[PDB]
Amino acid sequence: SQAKVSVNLNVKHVVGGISEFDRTKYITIHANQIENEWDGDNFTSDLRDHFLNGFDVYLGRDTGGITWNLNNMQEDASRPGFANPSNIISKGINTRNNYASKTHLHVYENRKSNHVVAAQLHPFWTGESQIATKGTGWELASPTATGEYMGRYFNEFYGGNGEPVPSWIEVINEPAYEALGGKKNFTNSLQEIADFHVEVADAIRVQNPNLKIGGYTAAFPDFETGDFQRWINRDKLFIDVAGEKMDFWSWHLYDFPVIGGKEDIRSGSNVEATFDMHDHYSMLKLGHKKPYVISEYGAQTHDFRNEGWSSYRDWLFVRAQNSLMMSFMERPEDIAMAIPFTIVKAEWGFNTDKNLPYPARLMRKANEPESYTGEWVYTDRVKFYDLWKNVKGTRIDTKSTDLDIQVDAYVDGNKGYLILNNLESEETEITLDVFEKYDSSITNILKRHLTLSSNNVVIEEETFSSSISTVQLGAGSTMILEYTFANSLTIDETSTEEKYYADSYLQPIVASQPILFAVNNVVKSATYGEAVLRLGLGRDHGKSLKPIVKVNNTEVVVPDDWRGYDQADKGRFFGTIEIPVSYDLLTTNNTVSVEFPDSSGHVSSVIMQVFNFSSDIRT
Ligand SMILES: [Ca+2]
Ligand SMILES: [Ca+2]
Ligand SMILES: [Ca+2]
Numbered sequence: 001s002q003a004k005v006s007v008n009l010n011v012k013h014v015v016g017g018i019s020e021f022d023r024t025k026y027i028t029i030h031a032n033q034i035e036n037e038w039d040g041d042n043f044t045s046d047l048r049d050h051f052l053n054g055f056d057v058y059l060g061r062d063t064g065g066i067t068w069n070l071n072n073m074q075e076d077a078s079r080p081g082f083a084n085p086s087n088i089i090s091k092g093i094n095t096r097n098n099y100a101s102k103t104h105l106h107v108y109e110n111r112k113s114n115h116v117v118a119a120q121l122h123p124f125w126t127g128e129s130q131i132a133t134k135g136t137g138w139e140l141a142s143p144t145a146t147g148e149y150m151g152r153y154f155n156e157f158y159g160g161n162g163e164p165v166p167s168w169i170e171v172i173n174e175p176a177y178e179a180l181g182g183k184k185n186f187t188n189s190l191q192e193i194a195d196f197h198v199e200v201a202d203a204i205r206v207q208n209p210n211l212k213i214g215g216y217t218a219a220f221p222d223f224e225t226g227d228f229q230r231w232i233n234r235d236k237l238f239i240d241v242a243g244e245k246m247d248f249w250s251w252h253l254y255d256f257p258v259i260g261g262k263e264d265i266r267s268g269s270n271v272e273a274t275f276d277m278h279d280h281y282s283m284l285k286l287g288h289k290k291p292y293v294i295s296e297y298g299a300q301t302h303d304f305r306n307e308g309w310s311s312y313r314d315w316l317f318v319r320a321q322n323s324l325m326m327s328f329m330e331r332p333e334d335i336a337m338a339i340p341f342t343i344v345k346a347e348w349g350f351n352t353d354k355n356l357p358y359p360a361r362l363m364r365k366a367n368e369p370e371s372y373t374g375e376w377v378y379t380d381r382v383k384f385y386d387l388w389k390n391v392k393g394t395r396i397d398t399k400s401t402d403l404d405i406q407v408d409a410y411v412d413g414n415k416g417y418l419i420l421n422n423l424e425s426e427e428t429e430i431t432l433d434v435f436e437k438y439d440s441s442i443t444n445i446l447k448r449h450l451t452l453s454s455n456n457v458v459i460e461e462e463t464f465s466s467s468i469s470t471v472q473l474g475a476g477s478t479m480i481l482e483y484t485f486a487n488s489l490t491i492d493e494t495s496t497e498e499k500y501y502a503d504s505y506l507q508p509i510v511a512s513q514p515i516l517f518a519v520n521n522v523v524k525s526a527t528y529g530e531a532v533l534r535l536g537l538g539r540d541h542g543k544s545l546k547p548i549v550k551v552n553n554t555e556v557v558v559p560d561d562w563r564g565y566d567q568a569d570k571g572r573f574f575g576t577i578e579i580p581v582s583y584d585l586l587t588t589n590n591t592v593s594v595e596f597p598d599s600s601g602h603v604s605s606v607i608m609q610v611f612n613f614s615s616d617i618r619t
Pocket of ligand 2: 402404
């Protein structure tokens with residue numbers, strides 16, 4: 001594979017007003033610094049420091065606190081099925097006081113800006129699978145009782161002298177996964193879960209109206225399944241039923257690189273189509289977008305579930321998290337918080353029947369996999385953080401000739417961070433076209449290559465004293481070039497990205513029948529720019545993904561090589577084809593014509609991604 005990556009160090013890339021890397025939202029871990037797992041017999045005396053400070057990692061998410069407390073909360077004697085308010089209060093005092101006493105944890109509040117808390121499914125869920133509180137043995141009366149508890153919980157177990165209230169409250173973790181029949185089900189309705197969210201959110205807001213509340217924390221947002229029936233029955237329905245009650249959308253986005261020997265990957269076009277369709281419908285139905293909390297993402301490793309830790313298994317996660325995070329970094333204004341699902345130790349997740357530890361761990365005992373003994377040492381998932389430890393600064397315009405090379409770049413004064421992320425399993429020779437208007441010289445490039453070498457995660461580093469023109473980006477690998485310039489870079493050009501949504505979505509594809517889309521009110525706020533027509537395509541394998549596309553009745557070239565892999569092992573293709581559209585083809589109200597040679601499937605979403613350049617930066 002070969003790709004040319006253009007890097008315009010003076011062009012700030014703005015979207016939704018955001019043009020700074022937000023490590024508090026992106027470089028995160030599914031932890032809370034209060035968790036005992038940060039302590040213990042660790043390879044270092046201060047794991048919190050070594051990890052959170054050492055790699056400048058942010059927080060975070062936890063569910064056990066609210067779940068344990070509900071599981072052990074006394075019942076309201078006057079209102080069966082409700083948590084007793086005075087016991088929520090009383091227990092909250094002890095929690096806040098305990099927190100206040102953990103003085104050495106208080107510094108890490110400045111890393112908890114996007115604290116996410118989700119209720120676990122039980123005993124919060126009031127549906128058919130509802131169980132009584134594990135400790136006190138009573139069943140939540142209603143979603144209202146659940147929301148009231150949660151509302152009281154967040155009022156009493158946070159604030160005051162205790163832990164600051166979390167910033168993102170997910171109503172309930174992965175409510176549909178089991179109850180609605182799993183990832184391939186598309187017939188079951190999310191109606192009850194949606195009503196659950198509305199009712200819980202109403203009750204939370206009653207107790208605390210200043211909590212951002214989200215749902216439905218989908219385990220697997222798979223919109224295309226069953227001719228998009230799954231989308232209709234679940235995620236569309238959630239927007240329809242709960243949209244006006246949610247402050248944010250919550251998703252878990254997991255690549256499945258090794259599920260029954262299949263490679264079912266969200267990274268690339270699929271996750272893009274997922275955001276695209278959900279955004280598009282949200283625009284059509286609600287008239288606005290909501291931020292996403294990706295409270296779990298990365299990879300799961302099903303074919304390894306009967307195996308312990310391995311570096312390669314960490315790789316599968318590390319590769320997924322990179323490729324997925326790059327997509328989240330393209331949409332900073334839509335991302336409230338994205339947390340790779342990496343638990344510090346997940347001792348609570350140890351599988352005693354299998355004598356295997358939880359798969360998703362920052363730490364492992366040194367003697368693993370051979371023995372669950374020895375001090376806690378890092379898994380190779382730390383290499384992700386190691387690689388990203390320095391990324392900060394102003395996002396600048398980057399571009400790849402190959403959509404499988406996801407590029408981003410951030411300039412922090414005289415430090416430049418160029419991220420090259422390989423969606424594909426091919427090594428790619430990247431030609432670097434780094435343009436800088438003001439001659440500012442490179443004093444140093446630290447080339448940090450996070451890749452798979454001998455089935456282990458490694459960061460291969462080379463250092464350079466002058467510009468480099470080509471790098472080898474490994475298969476599925478991520479490279480950060482940490483540039484140092486003689487002087488702070490002047491970022492006086494601007495690429496303002498605005499996204500525009502067709503007046504229609506989810507359009508059935510009929511052979512030789514053009515699907516006509518209006519993409520209207522496109523502000524061409526500059527003289528120079530470029531646009532990306534984003535066609536969400538949901539089609540069976542074997543159906544064409546190269547429609548004839550016209551923008552304002554001018555035919556535009558549809559790439560044969562879309563962002564990401566082929567999706568062969570996925571149930572079907574669901575992915576956004578990113579179609580270069582020239583700025584001069586764009587007008588205010590645009591028609592998009594999409595015509596396939598074959599029937600079936602749908603143009604799930606149509607988004608015109610418009611980039612408005614302060615100057616002719618492409619030429
Ligand atoms: Ca770009
Ligand atoms: Ca390619
Ligand atoms: Ca591709």
